[PDB]
Amino acid sequence: ALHPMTKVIFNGLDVNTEVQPLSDDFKQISDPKGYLTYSVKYEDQFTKKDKLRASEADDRIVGPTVNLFKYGAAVVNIDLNRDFFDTATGIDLTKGIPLVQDLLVPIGVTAGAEQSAEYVSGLLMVLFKVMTDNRLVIVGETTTPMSNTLSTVVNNVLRTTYHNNVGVNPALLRDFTQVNWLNRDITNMLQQAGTKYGLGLTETRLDYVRLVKTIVGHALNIDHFAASVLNINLRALMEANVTADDRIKALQAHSMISTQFHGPNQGALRPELAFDHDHIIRCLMLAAANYPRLEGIIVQINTGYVASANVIRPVSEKRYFPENLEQNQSAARLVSAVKARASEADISSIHLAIAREVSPMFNVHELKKIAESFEDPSSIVVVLEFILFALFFPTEFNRIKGDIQNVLLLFFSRWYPVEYGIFIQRGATYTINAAGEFEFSGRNEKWDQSLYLSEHFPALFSDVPLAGANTIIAIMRLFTPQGFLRTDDLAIAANFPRASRNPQTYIPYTNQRGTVTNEFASRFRTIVATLANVVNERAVQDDMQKATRSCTKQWLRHLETQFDNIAVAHTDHLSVVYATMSNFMLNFTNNFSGNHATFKPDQYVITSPEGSYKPIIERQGETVDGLTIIDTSIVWPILCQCTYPLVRQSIMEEIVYPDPSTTLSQSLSVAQVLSKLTLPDAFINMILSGGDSVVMRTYQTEADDDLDEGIRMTTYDQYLSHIRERLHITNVPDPIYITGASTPDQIAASVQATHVAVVLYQSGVINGSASTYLRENEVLVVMPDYYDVVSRFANANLQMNNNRYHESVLEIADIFDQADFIQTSDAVRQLRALMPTLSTSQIRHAIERIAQITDVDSTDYGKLTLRFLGTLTRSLKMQNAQIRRIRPDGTVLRYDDQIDIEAFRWSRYFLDELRLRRLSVGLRLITNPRIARRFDGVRIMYLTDDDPDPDFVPDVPEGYVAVQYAHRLFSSSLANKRNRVTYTHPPTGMAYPSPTGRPHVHMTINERAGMSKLVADNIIASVIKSNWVVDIHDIEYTAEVMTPSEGYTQHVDAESIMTAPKGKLFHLQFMDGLLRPEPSAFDPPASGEDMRLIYPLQPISVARSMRAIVNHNEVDRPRGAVAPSSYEMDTGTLSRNGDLLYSPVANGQVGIPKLEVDHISFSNVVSMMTANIRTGDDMAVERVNPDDVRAINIRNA
Amino acid sequence: FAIDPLKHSKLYEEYGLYLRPHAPTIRSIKYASLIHSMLAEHAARHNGTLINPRMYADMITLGNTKVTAIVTYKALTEMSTLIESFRLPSGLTLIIFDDEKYQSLIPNYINQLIAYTQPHIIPTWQGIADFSDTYLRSYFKRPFELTASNLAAPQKHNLSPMTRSIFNNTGREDAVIRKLYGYGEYVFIKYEGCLITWTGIYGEVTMMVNLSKRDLGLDVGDDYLKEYKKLLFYGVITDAIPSGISTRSTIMKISPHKMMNPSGGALAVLSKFLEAVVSTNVINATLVVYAEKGAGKTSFLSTYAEQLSLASGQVVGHLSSDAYGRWLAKTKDIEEPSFAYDYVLSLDTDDNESYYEQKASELLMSHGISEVAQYELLSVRKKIKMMDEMNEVLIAQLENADTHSERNFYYMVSTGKTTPRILIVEGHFNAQDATIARTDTTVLLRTINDTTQAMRDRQRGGVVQLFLRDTYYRLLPALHTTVYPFEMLESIKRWKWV
């Protein structure tokens, strides 16, 4: 926008960077599409095929309503929306119910029996599309009419404006329809007190500072299930109270320390959701479990930061030795040991060793196998290699400190032979006692990195003075770090995910400005001054040269000179990089906590009551092509053959402060992908959270009992595999042991403490006082085994018997009612009775079918990131997956309130804070009786079809006999020179060979499995000839209500209704014979009658809103024509919370919320943002680099 | 960027990446293209290589090394007044994005900076270049997909012509969508190929052809044999073999995709044969094409002889790849056989059985087997010993130069004057290279065919076809240049004829 070069006056804000949004979370649709729309089946005779034309100003409001409830509408149904639940998401809506092809299919059935389970899988994807409906409504093409152009029936309706897509709502039919009884019934309803229909601008929230309009609520024409979803997405975007200026907090973390960001101060007109803390840290623990290559990304983000900072540049000059000691004969044994260890300073791995220090460790690191002897006194080069690896990289020193003991115990057992024997009798490993003691093992074992995750520590690093080993312990005081412990103040203020309570990383060494002597360099003075005396004793004990001892000590103080020259650049410019790498997004674990003697990384696992637990940190040897092997020969290029941007002062350098946006955008594009990567895992395992079951029994304890009442009893092995692992999760005490003398108040003390009614049996004979308490409260008694279970109770009534029980299964969702652990709502309880018998291989097919449907938005790093991990997920069971710490022994600890973070207590099905709020609104859409049109139960009867309506359920006459169907009744018998299929009537015991003289039977078929085809012929032959009534309880079917002008299109044979698999989904067509043409009075009659074989049980057309919108020429209103229900025309108001209320029925009455009742309201106040908001833009800041790298403060603050 | 997008804007237009109209990044993309006019001059000054690229790369990438006898450090001094001119708080950064068309068009002076930069790499999904990354998303035109669900307004989805471009995924005509739906002033990305997501025996298989949706038929959910001939000529099945597509497989979905670019490492190997066919110097040039037994190349390189001979004005003839096996079965017994060219081609395809399919056929019996489903029951090392037994009847025709051996056949067919000037032999198994004669151009053909699926197809396949594909895959590794059958049809066209 401006011109080069020499800093002209700019009276604006010197913008140099532009900031992306932190989360691409919302869609931004303008004209909202509802979840339920009207669908009208016109009667082709009475209707008029024109387009109705009112006044032109009224034609934009009333127009598409009077052209949908046009004169002649037979039925008006309320069905699912076609252009929201479109064919891109697999849902088919042709036959009325949602149908998904291959989501939850049963196995072991005949090839057509998967059709009935397409309804249950339909109700998952209808639940799933509402659950992932992140729409956010922006004010569309709203027009504003003149009041003197609208008729006065519309002027009392219209609130000052309206959207052009006005929708369809029968309240607009007031004084616009031709039908007179409809116009009376709507006007009588709309003049009630409890409803008041409106359309348009209701509320207008002016801004507090700018005084412009921000949030308006337009009374739309949309169902309350879609409108409650569109109001939850707005009540959390505006009441989050965080603007787009809090992206700057995410930039101060990813840029250098003590930098500044000025402007633009956009205010509250530009809101954005807060970067969600509880959902990103909960999904990184699955992404660290299922995809263990995730360390390869987070290191590579941190590697790309170090290489972009230009912090260490390798040079081609080697100063390992001082001047003319290289060539000096006595030092020929020493120069071979240094040159063998030291290795060329590759630029790629010095940047790796820096980035590994603040990276999260998922694969357990292990040391490169250093094969040295510790034979000559020139072998101190390996020990000086480990001191420099302990000072420079003390975090990565800790992760492989055990394998250094495997090297250094060869050192001490060859130079201090008596001191080693004193030390190794104490132990080579030690544990931690529970009270805080040190328990030394007393064994001589080689360390392995397998022991790094267990309770054993390396024993050189105990820092405990052994009485008699004061030399080995004094050398081990040189491996102490020289750093500090900085809190992550920039990450918590930016609300980044962390895995701790206090996020504290270990910066390796202090910023050291303004000093003459460097307090980090002088620490290395006292180490060499200690190491000079160690090599002094080893040289003079084994009587080597005077020159070989001098040329050793002349080398030990050449590392003194080279350490002083570069510690000015480590403690001023490396230490500010380890501070700003600690505040990154994906560097979430703690790495080190000061002391080598006590630290272990906090082992989180993904536990599961129905599977194994998968640990996060785990030695599996999965190399990332050089990541788990750690090279300790990297400290020799760092000390000698690298030039630093502050060791060079004398050339002009201009210390590089890298941009925030590269390590920010890579960190979002990982934390945005895995935020939704476990999302099809998170839905099927949420419906099936309580689908697990235990096997109990129920012993009847008195007379006149049923199968369910009594004492509920299960075995101890059934308890230990299912219920015990779900009580250590829910953080309750153990259930008590009842001993026979137990009072019923003690049992009430355990149920009110452990919130499930479970008590354990121990011994004794349980008295009759507690036995009545175990009956009237359904308390589950856990027995060891079923050996004479009457004798364990005091059977004083003498009615409880061993061989009197009903063994049945008991779901976990029946005994646990916890909010965020087991989904126990009334909607989800219905689905697990409609699902077929699932398995752990059908949930796997259900997850991979949802992920094929979901086409989520990635980026050019996303799919690359997504690919990287990148294919294995199906190993971990995700039944009730929680995040719990384990002991280093290997038992899963309970949730401790004061160690773990708040977001690990209840893993909320690994979902979003918003996505649960859309879910409870979605479960109200599934349990709605208006869309539950999967009809089960059907009736065969041979009545006449004279006055057809789909509601007609033919009543069984008074003289029939109820007969249960079995396979014992029908059998072949020689009757009259012909084998006839003979029915045997169960009460009278007689035999009936021919289907004409059979008695009047109300046969009820419950099973129809293994039913013969001749028997299935004889029953349908018995309906026609002998007038039976046959109920089939197996047939699932849909139903379209045909208009009498369209006629029946297809038919259902009687062969299909009797000979079919259990899971076939039929399609019956019923005729609403209300608008049939009455014939002329002089017409000679027709010949035959209209018969009808198949009838329903439960009332068809539960989705019917209006029926037969015509006027009758003799009577006032037609026979059976219904009015639209008075809740379909009530806008009501919008509450302060965000709930949709109806209109109040009287003064001082809070109106009924629209989700509490099951009636459908097709007009709602939807809060939508105006054009003055613009959520999700690219705001613009001024980044100002700090002046000097030596002026940047790190600690304390 | 490596190539600047304001002087060279059409290459980004080929990827679906249009330049945002003219601010802190609109100002920065003009700053980066000013460096390329400075940089390009410098590597003129001394041909080509700009001198000291290390202090060069520590200026663009890093806000670093201000510099002010001299002429050595002249181009550094002229540049330190150019990058300290515009006030940046950090460097500019690179942006190669991993594409053999894009990586080939990088000029010489940018590539010398790549050693000393740590450049930013943007991973191509299949091409298009896929739009994350504050570089690629704040510089120009994050696009908007326009599939069959998001219809039909720009006001509806809150788009703006200065920020978002539109990707046509309707199947409607292009001209109407910016006529009646209001997408005027909204510029549209142009893609001239398409991507097919087929059904498979194993799963969803995404292949691409460089034909538009109009140039071939098949929408949506037509089978695999409908317009099979155009898919073989132009397709890549971007999937790890075995992909598992079959003749009973259908289409799931179609979206227009970028025309993929042929293989600069595999264009030039095939370009040697398209030079040796032209020059009057080289007598009897020869193209050798290796593939699996079910790659379907005898139906393919029968028309590539028809594309080369009509362009060269010469006579070519392919030896049809099994003409050793068909011929040796006919005259095992005959002391003087006829090596003539017209006798070989009037003998094969198909009714004469192959000699190895006699030998393989006898062998499968000995470890008694006749069913393809019985072959799955056999497993690897018990299978592999059969392959080793199968080899020893191979080497008896490869070792010496007898009068019935393979070396004599591909010699005397290639020499004897009745043959065409430039025959194309095709070989099944590698280490037939000591037999085919004589060339500098051996390619390796990978077609759109799961070849073992086509051998359970073949429709008189049996186990004899399927044992030998398996035997030949054990003898044919990918130690030659993969050639991808649309690239041989591409190189005829590029070559400049007389």
The full DSSP string for A817-880 is --TTTS---HHHHHHHHHS----TTHHHHHHHHHHHH------TTHHHHHHHS-S--TTS--SS
Say if CB A1131 and CB A1166 are below 8 A apart.
Answer: no
Which three-class secondary structure state does DSSP give residue A737? strand
Does any CB of chain B come closer than 8 Å to the CB of residue A852? yes
Q: How far apart are CA A905 and CA A902, in angstroms?
A: 6
Say if CB A300 and CB A275 are below 8 A apart.
Answer: no
| Neighbouring C-alpha atoms within 13 Å toward the C-beta of A63 | 13
Roughly what angle, to the nearest 10 degrees, separates helices B53-60 and B74-83? 0
Determine whether the interchain pair B129/A1178 forms a contact, defined as Cβ–Cβ distance below 8 Å: no
| A657 closest CB neighbour out of B26, B90, B130 | B90
Determine whether the interchain pair A30/B157 forms a contact, defined as Cβ–Cβ distance below 8 Å: yes
Q: How far apart are CA A276 and CA B35, in angstroms?
A: 41
- Name the residue among A65, A187, A36 with its Cα closest to residue A1162: A36
User: Among all chains, which residue has been given the structure tokens 């149908």?
Assistant: A99
Residues from chain A contacting residue B67 (CB–CB below 8 Å): 652
Q: Which of residues 297-326 of A touch B (CB under 8 A)?
A: 304, 307-308, 310
Between the CA of residue A129 and those of A86, A226, A431, A826, A981, what are the distances in Å? Answer: 11, 11, 52, 20, 53
Give me the total of CB pairs closer than 8 Å, taking one residue from chain A and one from chain B. Answer: 122
Does any CB of chain B come closer than 8 Å to the CB of residue A1180? yes
Between the CA of residue B104 and those of A841, B2, B6, what are the distances in Å? Answer: 48, 11, 19
Say if CB A224 and CB A1140 are below 8 A apart.
Answer: yes
Residues forming beta bridges with residue A962, ordered by sequence position: A1002
Q: What's the token pair of residue A353?
A: 């060793």
Burial class (CB in 10 A: 0-12, 13-18, 19+), B252: middle
Say if CB A630 and CB A280 are below 8 A apart.
Answer: no
Q: Give the 3-state DSSP-derived string for A710-731, with helices as H, strands as E and coil as C.
A: CEEEEEHHHHHHHCCCCCCCCC
Closest approach of B413 to chain A, Cα-based (Å):
50
Q: DSSP character for A1091?
A: B
Entry resolution (Å): 3.2
Closest approach of B478 to chain A, Cα-based (Å):
24
Domain coordinates in residue numbering, chain B: 1-140, 141-190, 191-261, 262-498
| B134 closest CB neighbour out of A138, A661, A1180 | A661
Does any CB of chain B come closer than 8 Å to the CB of residue A1185? yes
Does any CB of chain B come closer than 8 Å to the CB of residue A946? no
Q: How far apart are CA B352 and CA A1129, in angstroms?
A: 82
Q: Which of A6, A18, A648, A668 to mutate to test the interface with B (most CBs of B within 10 A)?
A: A18
Closest approach of B158 to chain A, Cα-based (Å):
6
Say if CB B314 and CB B294 are below 8 A apart.
Answer: no
Burial code (b: 16+ CB inside 10 Å, e: under 16) for A461-471 equals bbeeeeeebeb
Pairing of strands A484-487, A438-440: unpaired
**Sheet containing A979-984, strands listed edge to edge, beginning at the edge strand earlier in sequence:** A970-974, A979-984, A991-992
Q: Phi, psi (5° rounding) for residue A353?
A: -70, -30
Residues from chain B contacting residue A10 (CB–CB below 8 Å): none
Element at A782 (helix H, strand E): strand A780-783
Q: What's the token pair of residue A700?
A: 């009847």
Which three-class secondary structure state does DSSP give residue A938? strand
Determine whether the interchain pair A14/B87 forms a contact, defined as Cβ–Cβ distance below 8 Å: yes
| A86 closest CB neighbour out of B63, B149, B153 | B149
Cα torsion A548, A553, A555, A556 to 10°: value is: 150
The size of chain B, in residues, is 498
CB atoms within 10 A of CB A969: 17
Determine whether the interchain pair A308/B148 forms a contact, defined as Cβ–Cβ distance below 8 Å: no
Q: How far apart are CA A888 and CA B494, in angstroms?
A: 67
Cis peptide before A870 (omega within 30 of 0): yes
DSSP state letters, A548-575: HHHHHHHHHTHHHHHHHHHHHHIIIIIH
Return the sign of the alpha-carbon dihedral for residues A215, A218, A219, A222. negative
Instruction: Provide the residue type at A806 as one letter.
Output: H
Determine whether the interchain pair A5/B204 forms a contact, defined as Cβ–Cβ distance below 8 Å: no
Which three-class secondary structure state does DSSP give residue A1001? strand
- Name the residue among A120, A159, A165, A267 with its Cα closest to residue A208: A267
Residues from chain A contacting residue B134 (CB–CB below 8 Å): 18, 20, 661-662, 664-665
**CB neighbour list of residue B56: distance below 8 Å, 6 or more residues apart:** B39, B50, B76, B79, B113
Cis peptide before B152 (omega within 30 of 0): yes
Q: How far apart are CA A478 and CA A466, in angstroms?
A: 17
CB atoms within 10 A of CB A1103: 22
- Name the residue among A365, A576, A592 with its Cα closest to residue A481: A592
**Residues in chain A preceding a C-to-N separation beyond 2.5 angstroms (breaks):** 649
Task: Give the start-end residues of each E strand in B140-222.
Answer: 144-146, 166-168, 193-198, 205-209
Cis peptide before A5 (omega within 30 of 0): yes
Q: How far apart are CA A738 and CA A719, in angstroms?
A: 16
Element at A770 (helix H, strand E): helix A768-773
Name the residue in chain A with its Cα closest to that of B28: A16
| A860 closest CB neighbour out of B87, B123, B138 | B123
Pairing of strands A429-432, A260-262: unpaired
Determine whether the interchain pair A658/B23 forms a contact, defined as Cβ–Cβ distance below 8 Å: no
Burial class (CB in 10 A: 0-12, 13-18, 19+), A898: exposed
Which three-class secondary structure state does DSSP give residue A761? strand
Return the sign of the alpha-carbon dihedral for residues B361, B363, B365, B367. negative
Residues from chain A contacting residue B130 (CB–CB below 8 Å): 858-860, 863
Residues forming beta bridges with residue A1039, ordered by sequence position: A1068
| A657 closest CB neighbour out of B89, B153, B155 | B89
Q: How far apart are CA A435 and CA A697, in angstroms?
A: 45
| Neighbouring C-alpha atoms within 13 Å toward the C-beta of A596 | 29
